[PDB]
Amino acid sequence: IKLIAIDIAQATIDAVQAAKAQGIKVVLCTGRPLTGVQPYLDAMDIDGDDQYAITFNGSVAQTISGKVLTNHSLTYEDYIDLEAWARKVRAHFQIETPDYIYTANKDISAYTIAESYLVRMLIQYREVSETPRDLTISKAMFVDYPQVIEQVKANMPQDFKDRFSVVQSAPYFIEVMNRRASKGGTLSELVDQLGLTADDVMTLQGNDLTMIKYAGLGVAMIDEVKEAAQAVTGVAAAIR
Numbered sequence: 001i002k003l004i005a006i007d008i009a010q011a012t013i014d015a016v017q018a019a020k021a022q023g024i025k026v027v028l029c030t031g032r033p034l035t036g037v038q039p040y041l042d043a044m045d046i047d048g049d050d051q052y053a054i055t056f057n058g059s060v061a062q063t064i065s066g067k068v069l070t071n072h073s074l075t076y077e078d079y080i081d082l083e084a085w086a087r088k089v090r091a092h093f094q095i096e097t098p099d100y101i102y103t104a105n106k107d108i109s110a111y112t113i114a115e116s117y118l119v120r121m122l123i124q125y126r127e128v129s130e131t132p133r134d135l136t137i138s139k140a141m142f143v144d145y146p147q148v149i150e151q152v153k154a155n156m157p158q159d160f161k162d163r164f165s166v167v168q169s170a171p172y173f174i175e176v177m178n179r180r181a182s183k184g185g186t187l188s189e190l191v192d193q194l195g196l197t198a199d200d201v202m203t204l205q206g207n208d209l210t211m212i213k214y215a216g217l218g219v220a221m222i223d224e225v226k227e228a229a230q231a232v233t234g235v236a237a238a239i240r
Contacts, residue, residue, distance in 0.1 A: 005187050005203040015236030016044045028053045029183045035120040056138040058186035059177050070189045072181035074137045082140050091148050096139040104128045111143045111172045140176040184210020
């Protein structure tokens with residue numbers, strides 16, 4: 001076992017410094033952009049062109065130094081559709097890119113500032129005609145007060161539900177991404193790129209099913225995830 005994928009504590013830092021020193025590739029897995037996990041990576045020694053992280057729930061894999069390795073994005077026409085619906089239904093709307101949050105909201109949502117700050121990613125305001133056509137749109141999200149998001153949830157066109165993945169990650173968020181983009185599925189790509197195989201990896205919630213089934217040694221920490229799993233534990237625990 002030479003590669004560990006971990007979804008999302010000194011005992012845990014240490015157990016990582018360990019597997020790392022022993023020459024293991026530790027791959028953080030997160031719903032945020034890279035900047036969202038940069039702090040933990042700093043504290044765990046992890047960095048450079050040879051360390052890796054899957055971000056945006058596997059819509060992107062990249063080297064800690066920044067190079068995007070794989071990606072599964074929404075098209076520009078997708079953005080147009082989604083954004084045009086945001087205005088129809090009167091909800092704030094943003095998209096996340098590996099470098100920037102973008103919104104065309106001139107009255108920027110309190111929640112977009114929350115996100116920007118907590119996730120540590122800047123905001124580029126662009127009127128819709130100006131959002132660059134060559135963007136890597138990793139994630140799209142209706143961001144607003146719950147009564148609004150609720151109305152969004154209540155009015156989501158069947159068409160978007162089919163075309164993309166649409167899950168409510170918070171009372172104030174609804175995220176939209178590629179219909180086929182899992183942390184499990186993307187880890188498969190990062191692995192094939194490192195010249196390794198499923199039987200060399202150990203993975204470590206709900207959208208992790210694909211991550212356990214791929215891993216030769218998938219390990220759980222819910223109850224449908226424990227199924228597929230090959231073991232259960234708490235992180236340092238599984239490590240050692």
